[PDB]
Amino acid sequence: GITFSKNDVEIIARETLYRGFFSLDLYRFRHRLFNGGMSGEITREIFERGHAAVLLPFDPVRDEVVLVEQIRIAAYDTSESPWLLEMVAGMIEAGETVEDVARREALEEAGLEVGRTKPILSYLASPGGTSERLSILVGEVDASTAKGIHGLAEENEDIRVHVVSREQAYQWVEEGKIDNAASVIALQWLQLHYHNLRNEWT
Amino acid sequence: QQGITFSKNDVEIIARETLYRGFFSLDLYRFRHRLFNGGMSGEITREIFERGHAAVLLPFDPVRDEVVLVEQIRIAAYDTSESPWLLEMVAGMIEAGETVEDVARREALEEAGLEVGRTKPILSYLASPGGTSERLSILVGEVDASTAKGIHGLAEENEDIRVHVVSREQAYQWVEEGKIDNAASVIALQWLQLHYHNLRNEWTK
Ligand SMILES: Nc1ncnc2c1ncn2[C@@H]1O[C@H](COP(=O)(O)OP(=O)(O)O)[C@@H](O)[C@H]1O
Ligand SMILES: Nc1ncnc2c1ncn2[C@@H]1O[C@H](COP(=O)(O)OP(=O)(O)O)[C@@H](O)[C@H]1O
Ligand SMILES: [Mg+2]
Ligand SMILES: [Mg+2]
Ligand SMILES: [Mg+2]
Ligand SMILES: [Mg+2]
């Protein structure tokens, strides 16, 4: 496994490069080198946007997945359309739990009540340049109750629910029709775990 | 089942503004877009972290069923991880005019000392598209893991990298346990866990 711990790095300072809705910070630090020495002072620009809870809504009776569609303007330059098919997800505020955020977002974004839950995994989105961590849960849902247009319109959140079979959702990953990290990770996990999960929940 | 509802015809990007430029940039996108229930939104603004795009290489030895991992410090992991040194895939920024495959092969040499034989695409994904434009394109690359050792990276760029070789099964168990928890490695190793049997047959023929 890994070689060094937090005993082996010192963050000297952090400087706010930009403060707005999100922040960009310059971390200044030194760290041990694999050759046995210490680095000089290194600086890295880090996008600070908090952390997220992600919910894979899975109906184990029907073997169906609920997806939410909404515009993500950052996708525009590299994608055929900025409207993406994604997992229910939202930002975790101070003092909130991953699971409470997932439930609230499932109601706001898909009109869905959630039953049992299990962790999938918690990942760093792109740790060379952002601190963001996203914690994914699978949540038991009745996909027949998932339909229509949701999102908080007063916060400019316009979301369309789509229900697909599990195998259909995974085919959409393999074809590139679903191509955001949270959904790819959740759906590849589901393809590796669905047999045991369906047995546990039925 | 149809799929997505709207296209680039259905959004108007009114303006982009660079709010910060250094090594990376933070841009403000200003736009309006079609709504599912009919009309057009008002003007919306979003802050978008712009850092270009990346090529990622999963180094897989199909003879030995082994993967090569690279270890380096990622200081952004500090606040939410036990250690900021992460076990990762070979990966590099794509510059103008260079292909995913060109970058993946070059970085495999610079970061791990690895010659790569055949390659195949895995997936191309958006890292976190609510706040960053970054797209990463993953290939799997054929390597001899018995050649993989030592300390690499470009010292002139303060890039200090240690090579590790483990079985595919160990790498995947480390994903399950949270010891590998960066998106590119999670996606690549979950793909490998779903596809390794056919891949080994293809590459040892
Ligand atoms: N990139 C951004 N720039 C500015 N505001 C944002 C950005 N991303 C999200 N917001 C604000 O936060 C709200 C919720 O964000 P949303 O993207 O729906 O949650 P998540 O990204 O966790 O799924 C948005 O309606 C918007 O007001
Ligand atoms: N967040 C950052 N802030 C400042 N410089 C960076 C940052 N991330 C990477 N760099 C610089 O750019 C180089 C890019 O190396 P490369 O292997 O192409 O990218 P990655 O860090 O994504 O694997 C790093 O070795 C470092 O010198
Ligand atoms: Mg959301
Ligand atoms: Mg929301
Ligand atoms: Mg790299
Ligand atoms: Mg490199």
From TrEMBL, chain A:
SUPFAM superfamilies: Nudix. It catalyses: ADP-D-ribose + H2O = D-ribose 5-phosphate + AMP + 2 H(+). It is an enzyme of class 3 (hydrolase). GO terms for cellular component: cytosol. It holds the Pfam family NUDIX. Its EC number is 3.6.1.13. A motif (Nudix box) lies at residues 90-112. Its cofactor is Mg(2+). Residues 48-186 form the Nudix hydrolase domain. GO terms for molecular function: ADP-ribose diphosphatase activity; ADP-sugar diphosphatase activity; metal ion binding; nucleotide binding. Mg(2+) 2 binds at E105, E109, E155. One of its GO terms (biological process) is ribose phosphate metabolic process. InterPro entries: NDP_pyrophosphatase, NUDIX_hydrolase-like_dom_sf, NUDIX_hydrolase_CS, NUDIX_hydrolase_dom. AMP binds at E45, R72, G128, E155. Mg(2+) 1 binds at A89, E105, E109, E157. Keywords: Hydrolase, Magnesium, Metal-binding, Nucleotide-binding. It comes from the Bacteria. Mg(2+) 3 binds at E105, E109, E157. Belongs to the Nudix hydrolase family. NudF subfamily. Homodimer. NCBIfam families: nudix-type nucleoside diphosphatase, YffH/AdpP family, PRK10729.1. Acts on ADP-mannose and ADP-glucose as well as ADP-ribose. Prevents glycogen biosynthesis. The reaction catalyzed by this enzyme is a limiting step of the gluconeogenic process. This is ADP-ribose pyrophosphatase. It comes from Klebsiella pneumoniae subsp. pneumoniae (strain HS11286).
UniProtKB/TrEMBL annotation, chain B:
The lineage of its organism: Bacteria, Pseudomonadati, Pseudomonadota, Gammaproteobacteria, Enterobacterales. Mg(2+) 2 binds at E107, E111, E157. Acts on ADP-mannose and ADP-glucose as well as ADP-ribose. Prevents glycogen biosynthesis. The reaction catalyzed by this enzyme is a limiting step of the gluconeogenic process. This is ADP-ribose pyrophosphatase. Keywords: Hydrolase, Magnesium, Metal-binding, Nucleotide-binding. Its cofactor is Mg(2+). It catalyses: ADP-D-ribose + H2O = D-ribose 5-phosphate + AMP + 2 H(+). It comes from Klebsiella pneumoniae subsp. pneumoniae (strain HS11286). PROSITE patterns: NUDIX, NUDIX_BOX. A motif (Nudix box) lies at residues 92-114.
